[PDB]
Amino acid sequence: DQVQKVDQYLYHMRLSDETLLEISKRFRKEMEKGLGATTHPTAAVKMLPTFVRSTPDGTEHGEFLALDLGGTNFRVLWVKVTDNGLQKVEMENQIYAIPEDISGTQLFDHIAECLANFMDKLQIKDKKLPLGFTFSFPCHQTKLDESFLVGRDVVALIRKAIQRRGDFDIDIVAVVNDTVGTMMTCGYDDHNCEIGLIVGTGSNACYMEEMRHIDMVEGDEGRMCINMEWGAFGDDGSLNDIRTEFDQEIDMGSLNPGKQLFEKMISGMYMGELVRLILVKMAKEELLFGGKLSPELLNTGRFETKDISDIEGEKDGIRKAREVLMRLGLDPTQEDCVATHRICQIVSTRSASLCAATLAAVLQRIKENKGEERLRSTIGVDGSVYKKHPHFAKRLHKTVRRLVPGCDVRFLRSEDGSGKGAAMVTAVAYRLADQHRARQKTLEHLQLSHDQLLEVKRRMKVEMERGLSKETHASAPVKMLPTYVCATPDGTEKGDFLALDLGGTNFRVLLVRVRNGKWGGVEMHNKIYAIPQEVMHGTGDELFDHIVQCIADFLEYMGMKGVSLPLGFTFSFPCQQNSLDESILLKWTKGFKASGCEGEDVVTLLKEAIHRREEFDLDVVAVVNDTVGTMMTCGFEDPHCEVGLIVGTGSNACYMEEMRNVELVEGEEGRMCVNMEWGAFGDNGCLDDFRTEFDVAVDELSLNPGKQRFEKMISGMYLGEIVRNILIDFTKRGLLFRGRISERLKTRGIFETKFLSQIESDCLALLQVRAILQHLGLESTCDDSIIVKEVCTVVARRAAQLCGAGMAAVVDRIRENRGLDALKVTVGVDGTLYKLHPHFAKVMHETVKDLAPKCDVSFLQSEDGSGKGAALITAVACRI
Ligand SMILES: Cc1oc(S(=O)(=O)NC[C@H]2O[C@H](O)[C@H](NC(=O)c3cccc(Br)c3)[C@@H](O)[C@@H]2O)cc1C(=O)O
Ligand SMILES: Cc1oc(S(=O)(=O)NC[C@H]2O[C@H](O)[C@H](NC(=O)c3cccc(Br)c3)[C@@H](O)[C@@H]2O)cc1C(=O)O
Numbered sequence: 001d002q003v004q005k006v007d008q009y010l011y012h013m014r015l016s017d018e019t020l021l022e023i024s025k026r027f028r029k030e031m032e033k034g035l036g037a038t039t040h041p042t043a044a045v046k047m048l049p050t051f052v053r054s055t056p057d058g059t060e061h062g063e064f065l066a067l068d069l070g071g072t073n074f075r076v077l078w079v080k081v082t083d084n085g086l087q088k089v090e091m092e093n094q095i096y097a098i099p100e101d102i103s104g105t106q107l108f109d110h111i112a113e114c115l116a117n118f119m120d121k122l123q124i125k126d127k128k129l130p131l132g133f134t135f136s137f138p139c140h141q142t143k144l145d146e147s148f149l150v151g152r153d154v155v156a157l158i159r160k161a162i163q164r165r166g167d168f169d170i171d172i173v174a175v176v177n178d179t180v181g182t183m184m185t186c187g188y189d190d191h192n193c194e195i196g197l198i199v200g201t202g203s204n205a206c207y208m209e210e211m212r213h214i215d216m217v218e219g220d221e222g223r224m225c226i227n228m229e230w231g232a233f234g235d236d237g238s239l240n241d242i243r244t245e246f247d248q249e250i251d252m253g254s255l256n257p258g259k260q261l262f263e264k265m266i267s268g269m270y271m272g273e274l275v276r277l278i279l280v281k282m283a284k285e286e287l288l289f290g291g292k293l294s295p296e297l298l299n300t301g302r303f304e305t306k307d308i309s310d311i312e313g314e315k316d317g318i319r320k321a322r323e324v325l326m327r328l329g330l331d332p333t334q335e336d337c338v339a340t341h342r343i344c345q346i347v348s349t350r351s352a353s354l355c356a357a358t359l360a361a362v363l364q365r366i367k368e369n370k371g372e373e374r375l376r377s378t379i380g381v382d383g384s385v386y387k388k389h390p391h392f393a394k395r396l397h398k399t400v401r402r403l404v405p406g407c408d409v410r411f412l413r414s415e416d417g418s419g420k421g422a423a424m425v426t427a428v429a430y431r432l433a434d435q436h437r438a439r440q441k442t443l444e445h446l447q448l449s450h451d452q453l454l455e456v457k458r459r460m461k462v463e464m465e466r467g468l469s470k471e472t473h474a475s476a477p478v479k480m481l482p483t484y485v486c487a488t489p490d491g492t493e494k495g496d497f498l499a500l501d502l503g504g505t506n507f508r509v510l511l512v513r514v515r516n517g518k519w520g521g522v523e524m525h526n527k528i529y530a531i532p533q534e535v536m537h538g539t540g541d542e543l544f545d546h547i548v549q550c551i552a553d554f555l556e557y558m559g560m561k562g563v564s565l566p567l568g569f570t571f572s573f574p575c576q577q578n579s580l581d582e583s584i585l586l587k588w589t590k591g592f593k594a595s596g597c598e599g600e601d602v603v604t605l606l607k608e609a610i611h612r613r614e615e616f617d618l619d620v621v622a623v624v625n626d627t628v629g630t631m632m633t634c635g636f637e638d639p640h641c642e643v644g645l646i647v648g649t650g651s652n653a654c655y656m657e658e659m660r661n662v663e664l665v666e667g668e669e670g671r672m673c674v675n676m677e678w679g680a681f682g683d684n685g686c687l688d689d690f691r692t693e694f695d696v697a698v699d700e701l702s703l704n705p706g707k708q709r710f711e712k713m714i715s716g717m718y719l720g721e722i723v724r725n726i727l728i729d730f731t732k733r734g735l736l737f738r739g740r741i742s743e744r745l746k747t748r749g750i751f752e753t754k755f756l757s758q759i760e761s762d763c764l765a766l767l768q769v770r771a772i773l774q775h776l777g778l779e780s781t782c783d784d785s786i787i788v789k790e791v792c793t794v795v796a797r798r799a800a801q802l803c804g805a806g807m808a809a810v811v812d813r814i815r816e817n818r819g820l821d822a823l824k825v826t827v828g829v830d831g832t833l834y835k836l837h838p839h840f841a842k843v844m845h846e847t848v849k850d851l852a853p854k855c856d857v858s859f860l861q862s863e864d865g866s867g868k869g870a871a872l873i874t875a876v877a878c879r880i
Contacts, residue, residue: 003338007346019242023242026239057738062081069133074111075419093419109164125167130427133154177204179228181418185420193378193379195362197355199381199386200385204228208223247265265354274347352395363400386413396411397411447794468674477684477686481625500551502569511524512875536593568622570865570869570870629866629868630862641826643828645807645829645834648715737778759772824856
């Protein structure tokens with residue numbers, strides 16, 4: 001019944017979950033104030049960047065030194081870290097004294113000397129090792145190696161002191177707060193640990209934070225640990241409705257009035273004192289001890305945090321309260337001991353609840369940063385309150401987990417403390433460096449020197465000459481097909497042309513209208529039709545009847561029903577083409593089972609189907625390959641365009657060639673367009689020394705192994721498969737995705753050209769790269785985004801440079817034909833990669849300018865077809 005009296009008396013010290021979530025939201029605002037640039041200088045929670053960029057992944061290894069300086073004593077540690085799988089650290093340490101005599105230079109001279117004794121005593125003085133520092137307060141820190149004590153940089157001092165000895169030398173330095181060392185130690189055993197926590201004589205906490213939220217450090221990429229210094233929460237008044245008169249009293253009787261106010265609520269230094277003030281006051285009000293007081297009860301610090309831990313710890317704590325009160329000089333009754341015991345619980349429970357509230361906000365922010373619904377997270381924990389107070393860890397654990405239902409949160413107590421932590425920072429720093437040059441060693445295989453592309457250019461040369469002559473054209477991989485397109489535009493052409501573009505299950509039927517003369521141009525009308533799955537699995541004669549009405553329908557839908565026209569034809573399928581108007585289907589592709597086609601002339605197939613529709617009677621002028629149509633299409637814009645190019649789900653190219661050089665066609669006078677089928681470049685082995693294991697792996701798993709090898713380096717779904725195979729390799733090697741391969745990352749096809757283009761065009765915080773990686777079902781961590789964006793940029797650059805080297809041959813092979821030097825030529829280009837990719841165009845233009853300096857090459861975009869150039873080759877065929 002004295003419990004309820006205390007409860008009602010101390011009511012403002014018993015915090016409802018409501019109050020705690022409100023306090024949690026308040027802390028969230030303070031975190032944003034300290035992180036933001038304009039609000040940081042007056043923010044009470046400083047949110048200091050630690051410059052620690054990553055937690056441990058468990059494979060850290062090496063030997064490391066550290067110093068922990070508290071004053072009047074300090075330790076020098078040697079930390080041996082092995083990657084054997086056990087994550088078992090090896091330590092030795094030694095304590096040295098700093099007498100009152102030990103001027104700055106004298107002090108660090110003494111420190112370097114001890115460190116020198118320690119290294120000699122320890123065998124290691126010929127070794128040059130990293131050195132961590134740990135401090136129990138903040139300094140002013142602009143980089144891992146720096147801090148100003150606030151009067152000078154302590155790293156410069158210890159380094160210049162080492163230089164004056166000449167004994168040993170020291171490697172990279174890190175200076176970290178003791179919360180940070182706690183997090184780092186725990187994160188070496190548990191790699192979900194993103195939060196250091198200390199509830200000690202003092203209290204503070206740190207966490208990993210995303211660089212896009214840290215204004216005070218340049219750059220938006222990745223993460224950095226933030227030392228919150230949350231002891232100062234409420235220094236500006238934010239907590240003053242939670243804080244009581246006892247809280248106020250402690251603050252005025254403190255060495256630092258008005259500072260560290262949240263600490264003064266929750267930590268062990270003031271915790272017992274805060275209980276004394278309640279006893280003094282209740283007694284002065286005659287609610288305890290019959291009003292009597294003792295000289296010791298009114299002396300500060302005489303009731304100790306240790307006494308709280310005792311009183312709640314023993315099964316009889318009323319007896320242990322009787323004894324503490326007696327030592328204070330009082331004569332307690334049973335009630336007085338009941339009330340004392342309970343006051344101890346209320347105070348210690350408030351400390352545990354206030355930690356929960358602010359831990360809740362940190363957990364919530366890490367959760368919104370990662371952006372999933374559920375969060376596995378571990379809190380590295382240290383300090384004398386949470387370790388040696390009997391019930392408080394339980395109370396903290398239970399309250400945190402209530403306040404964050406969305407989180408599975410482990411607690412792990414750090415034993416060995418802050419010595420290894422600073423050491424572990426330098427160990428993780430070495431690991432980041434090793435993994436960087438590791439994955440850069442793989443990427444170097446995909447970065448080609450200007451001398452290497454010239455060699456690739458050369459081999460495109462020989463393979464072109466080889467395909468044109470009649471001797472090797474059977475053996476040549478680049479087949480150099482004659483198109484029988486012998487002429488290019490004038491301003492002359494005028495009329496209406498139909499284009500039938502058929503490959504895959506949906507053809508388009510298009511009407512092309514040409515306005516001659518300067519200005520003028522072309523407009524399009526298409527319509528898309530589907531070939532039903534029956535029609536495609538049936539006979540070929542019912543296939544082209546279905547085709548022919550879709551022409552009849554659209555001609556009518558143009559309003560033109562009943563008019564005869566000339567017609568160009570895009571038939572995308574393996575073909576032997578013997579004449580402009582004649583082509584033989586070799587193999588069906590794309591899913592067409594239609595009988596009576598392979599081995600037949602596709603135009604007679606189409607023409608005999610036009611005879612049968614009783615009205616129809618249209619004229620079939622030409623059969624074309626889609627690159628040829630691309631070249632022709634911007635020939636109407638630019639008369640100087642001799643070359644087509646498509647970079648897309650596939651890649652191909654064509655130029656106008658001297659008929660002297662085409663030996664598969666009788667007669668040497670004039671020029672003829674050559675459809676290279678240059679995706680087949682490299683299928684004889686000529687690129688085999690540029691093909692990585694990743695190229696080889698894409699090749700073996702496609703529909704057409706050993707075939708179209710150059711197309712698979714420069715374009716298609718193949719780029720994202722190259723990317724994926726690299727990413728899998730990095731992950732097997734521990735270099736990405738923390739060494740664990742999703743079944744979803746083993747899914748072939750997931751990296752799609754549209755995604756390689758957005759990934760590469762994203763900057764700053766890479767939110768769009770992470771978004772895509774979430775979309776595809778992959779780990780999205782900031783660190784992972786950078787790497788993935790890098791792999792994409794490398795792969796897409798090689799594709800553009802390789803495309804440049806080969807397109808460089810073509811413009812010289814046009815030039816050596818004519819014996820010329822400086823040429824202005826223009827290339828019509830189509831295809832989705834080149835239009836939509838951010839850097840692909842520019843890189844290839846640069847590549848062509850670099851490896852063909854004598855040629856001056858413009859690239860004009862064409863598009864529209866492909867299938868539309870089919871009617872424009874007809875306009876120039878209806879020429880004669
Ligand atoms: C293991 C252990 O560590 C300690 S501790 O008290 O030495 N370190 C905890 C935190 O204490 C303070 O809050 C520090 N801030 C300041 O002093 C500070 C000073 C000025 C301005 C500002 Br703003 C902050 C924090 O930086 C520090 O992390 C006790 C124990 C134990 O076992 O009892
Ligand atoms: C506008 C655009 O066009 C395309 S595309 O894929 O239709 N054209 C590129 C090339 O594809 C392959 O390389 C073709 N060769 C063969 O398959 C081939 C031909 C003969 C034998 C063997 Br064995 C293979 C070439 O004829 C064709 O030029 C994609 C896009 C886009 O924007 O994504």
